[PDB]
Amino acid sequence: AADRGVILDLDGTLADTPAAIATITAEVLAAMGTAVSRGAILSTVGRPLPASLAGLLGVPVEDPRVAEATEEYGRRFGAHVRAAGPRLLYPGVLEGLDRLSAAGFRLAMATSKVEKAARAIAELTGLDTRLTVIAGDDSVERGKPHPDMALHVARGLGIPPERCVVIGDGVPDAEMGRAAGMTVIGVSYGVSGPDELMRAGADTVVDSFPAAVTAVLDG
Ligand SMILES: [Mg+2]
Structure with missing residues (x-):
């Protein structure tokens, strides 16, 4: 695992x-x-x-x-x-999360949505049964770009920051992960372009959620 x-x-x-x-x-x-x-x-x-x-x-x-x-x-x-419903999600998201779980990765959500909205979305999409921890902007005093949300969910997973990766499409995600001492995989298909995410401290940028899953699986 x-x-x-x-x-x-x-x-x-x-x-x-x-x-x-x-x-x-x-x-x-x-x-x-x-x-x-x-x-x-x-x-x-x-x-x-x-x-x-x-x-x-x-x-x-x-x-x-x-x-x-x-x-x-x-x-x-x-x-x-x-x-x-589940078409809220990009193609390959549930399958990819299931493969990460199969390989013994522990999964959390760290969103800028409020936690109740995050939970409701998780439930309606099927993310909920893949995620061990969900945190949103109001789960912690300091939300993104501060590290706190990432530190909070890592503790909930039982995994130290040095063994966590943040996956996100935003500069605040990359800033959050770097501040938390985590590796960051940026994705280019959301609100940011690749150069911005690199300049914000992403270790790599990928072009699809399956490609992010592959990056994690292959180390
Ligand atoms: Mg985002």
Whole structure:
């Protein structure tokens, strides 16, 4: 058994959500009576939701307008997840996670979604039965890019950081993993290009989730 850990981002890594996040963010803003530049939305995609919506609304994060928006987003996104079911996931995700488990890797999710939303997504997609630990942005005091979430789930897995790899599509994932003393496999099919992820400290970048699985399996 490998007795190693794999710490997986959700949005843009396991779940093919970036396009839907942008759309639904726009739907929420319109519901809230406003709109923002396309590029502003795109810069937030997959980042923590209250902070992102507060930035887009241009208001303090504690402003009641933010909780109104986050609640509306939860309704719309929840409906999207029921419409997608397992097709929320990229091809080969469940199979790849099962192969990592078969090889004795212990699996966790570290997402910028809130934990309850992460759990619900895990349940609707089938990730839940592959993952030993799930953490989201509100599971820890300091979310991405801080190491804390990765350190927290590694402890839950019983694997030290030196034996964990972070897999993600975002600069915050790469920063989180490096800060935590972990290896990082960037993926290029989500919100970031390969050069950005390299420059953020990814040890390698791959172009598909099966390719990330292969990288881990082959050491
Ligand atoms: Mg992501």
